[PDB]
Amino acid sequence: LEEMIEFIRIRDVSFEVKGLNPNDNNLYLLFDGVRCAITPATG
Amino acid sequence: ASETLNVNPYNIPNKQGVLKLTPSEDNWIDTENLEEMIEFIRIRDVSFEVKGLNPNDNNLYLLFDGVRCAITPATGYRKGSEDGTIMTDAKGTAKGKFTIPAGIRCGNREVTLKNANSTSATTYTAQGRKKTAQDIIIRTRVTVNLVDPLAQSFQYDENRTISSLGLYFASKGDKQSNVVIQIRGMGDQGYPNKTIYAETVMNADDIKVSNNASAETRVYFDDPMMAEGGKEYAIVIITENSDYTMWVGTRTKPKIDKPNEVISGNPYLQGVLFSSSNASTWTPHQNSDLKFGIYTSKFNETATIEFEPIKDVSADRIVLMSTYLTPERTGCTWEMKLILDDMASSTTFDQLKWEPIGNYQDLDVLGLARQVKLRATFESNRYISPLMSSSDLTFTTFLTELTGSYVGRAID
Amino acid sequence: INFKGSPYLDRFDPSKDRTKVLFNPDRPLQQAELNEMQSIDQYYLKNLGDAIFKDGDKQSGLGFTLSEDNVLTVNPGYVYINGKIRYYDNDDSVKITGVGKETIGIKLTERIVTPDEDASLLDQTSGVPSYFSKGADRLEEKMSLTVNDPTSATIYTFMDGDLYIQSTNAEMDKINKVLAERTYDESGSYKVNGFELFSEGNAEDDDHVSVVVDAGKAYVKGFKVDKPVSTRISVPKS
Amino acid sequence: INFKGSPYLDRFDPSKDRTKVLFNPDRPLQQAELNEMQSIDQYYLKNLGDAIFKDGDKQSGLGFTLSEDNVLTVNPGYVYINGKIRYYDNDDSV
Amino acid sequence: NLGDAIFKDGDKQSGLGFTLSEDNVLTVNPGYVYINGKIRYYDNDDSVKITGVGKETIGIKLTERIVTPDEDASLLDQTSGVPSYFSKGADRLEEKMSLTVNDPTSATIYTFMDGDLYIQSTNAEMDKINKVLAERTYDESGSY
Amino acid sequence: MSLTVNDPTSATIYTFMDGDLYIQSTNAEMDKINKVLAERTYDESGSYKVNGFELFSEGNAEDDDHVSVVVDAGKAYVKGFKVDKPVSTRISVPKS
Amino acid sequence: PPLNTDPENLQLGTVTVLPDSDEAVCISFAITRLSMEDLQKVKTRVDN
Amino acid sequence: PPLNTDPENLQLGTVTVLPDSDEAVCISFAITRLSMEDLQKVKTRVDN
16 A cells, blocks of 8 residues: 555663652563663763 | 331233243254255254143244244143143143254254243254255244242352342232232333343242341242352343242331331342332332342362263264353363173273264264264363253264265266 | 411511521520421522422322223322322322313322321320320421312323323333434435235235235334234235 | 431321421421421422432542452542432541 | 422523623622522513633622611501600511622522633523433434 | 441441552542443453564573463454553463 | 335335235335445445 | 454454464454454455
């Protein structure tokens, strides 16, 4: 037909989260629930 | 309860006795000569009972899909003076069998055991697929009834398979009049709808009486009825006769057992009583209810339906066209242990496994069967289970021919 | 009523919107105050109830039993009148004509009640008429039934000996009329399935086509159309 | 409690539709009348509730905490009981 | 108690179809309203003017009184001749309505925006119902 | 005024099935109107699909006795009732 | 032939009661909702 | 196919979980929503 795109690109996505526990730990990023890899921005 | 209730104080009839079909449905294929519905219902004999007609009601003929059939009485019963008809016993009970006519198109059909003295009707069922066409052929049917009766809205709150009610009478009529309990839904009168959900006939033989609403009169239906949650049903408490006097409770009244003590509004505000001089003049009791209990099949979480084998099956091909509902939280596995005409002598269902089969789809033996022991396994929940009719039921089989040309027609 | 006049003294004014009586001790008893204190509340009651209902609005009990000579019994029950709900404890049963419309409706039946008529209301704390026994009188107005007085508190109309209309519980019927008509506003005169125009000879009456038809289900006027039957209807041969 | 007993005597009749009290001038009085006046009003009031509601018809407030031993603590609000809408007086948690 | 379970203060009931004006007087036409527990027939003729800019709310305010037989020859005893001993018995509560502009205390019965009666709540029922229906006719299939 | 429990003839504000509130029906009208509309919607269009929901797959490399079924998102008034299921679908079901 | 003026009753097709007899023929013009008929003409010309 | 009849769960078809494996296949008698799959019964024979 004439159609949208088969894949979203492998884009780099920065992020921020708020309002977890004080110094909460082992926080896995789950893109579509799928475990991906965080760059921990130290601090 | 706080007082009796005379179920028809009008004391006015409408003479629908209550018919049963045995078998009540079919699954079949027919060389009647698209991947169609099953064309004509094969000409097949149905046994029956009908109840609560006139005392020795006479000339009761039968119409199937509204087409005139011939009854043969069962024992306990004569023909009418007319034949192709029955004369009941004194309760208006009649039993027997008749033949499903030719020209009976595939689908559900209305079976009409009657004369002018009493009517009765109920539906036969017939639907599925042929693998080769000819004609599609369907005509269908429709079912309802009315009286001067009592009725009672009642809900169920979660889905449960009603097995029976329980009720109490102050007094009762004779052995040949009756209450019929139907169960129904509700209409935008706020009163019951007209639909036959469930039905059961209850003479004074069938009814228990008490001075203090305790004679636990149990309303059992023939199969169950599934009372879904979040919904008012109604009981329709069909009778011609006043003298069935139950035990109702009503708004702030002295209770019959212990009259020092007085009722709520409606005893069971999750319900509403009604009384009517035509099954529509219904008294809205925002004041009242029956004294009653209700009971369901507390099912266990699975079942075995261990069939007796089909034998000398002698068929290289197979079908399942059984029929059932599996509700949610239920399952109906379907299996065979196939001894074959292909097989050796010691081969026994004991050596065979529960080999499963798919419904409404063809299957192969690839050479002849000779015994099919069968089981369906149910899976279920505490209150609900699959429900399969023993005449919705086929494990169909086939032999194929060794020769059969495509002769094309002559060509100019 | 002019209960303002003695013995009843009744000074209330709804249109001032009087709302309490405010007394003093050691009292010689100008009792207008009591007649008034009751009637004060009964006007606000009247205002508040008549927002909800018309006189003759049926509540509970209230089935019917039309006799064959056409004395309509209405089965006893709760009915609305003119600020308030009242129980039609009567079965008070009225000859309807059974032809055309029949405006069935009530009168609440005024009687003023002295203890002097009603000795059951004379001072049973001492020697019965023992003087205390003329403290007050009453009004009383038991409901009673009428037909083809449309100014009576009209509970029903019967058409040709039918009850003319049968949606007893009725607020869902506004909703129904609306939804069925929404099943008409987009479109609503349609075969959802079935009904199509086959043929078959009537041969019993060998002078008509016994028109063979299957089931169908549908909406027409957007109201639900549902005739599932094995059909054979006679229309004459050509 | 019954105000048809002495001295209160309450000789009201709802089945008659006794409708109004017509008190009489400068009056040594059977206080017998008086229960029976509120009784008259109580019938029509009661009717205008009980033809319409069920006892335990909640009208405000009544969200809840189930105390986790299972003491239900409904967070309080309005309720119907016979004849009338009333604030439900308590949580009364049990 | 029973009024407040059904109605809210400022629920209009009859009459009231504005005698609005260029002067921005709304003579709020006599008719019924629910205020302070009670349905009340509004029978005044108090003309309040608006500005015709921004949000303007029209609302009724009730005010109470004790009123005495000194003020009222009607509170002077038909056990008796009026102007004598016995006669000057109980006083009365009374509760009457008045029209107000922008008063948050008032039971608001109309609201205006730039002189528009931008509100018109013409139903408690078929309004609330179509706020389901044509909205479902947008929703999980619709809007076209 | 006072409270009781397991007297059903008491002014029964609630029932708490298994210490669940047995339901939570806490509007008088919108609930009752839905008990019209989504109900008609079943009557005319029961448990049916508008779109999506279709039956491809993905393997459970997280629990590799399982499929981790990717099946599409999709919509209908399914069971007469307002369904859109937009999901990151990867559902655990056994392997064969 | 099928073009008809009743709003209460539906333009399905014709029963066409025969000479001396009873039986149907409708090789004729017609009307239907959203024209499910036209949507069937497309299927029908795909059968052609 | 287990031919389930749960009156909430609609006939999509099958995720035929593969042997020693996991995946899907759907060639079947199974019928999805109100036969509107008709659109593709037509478009298939057009596409031939």
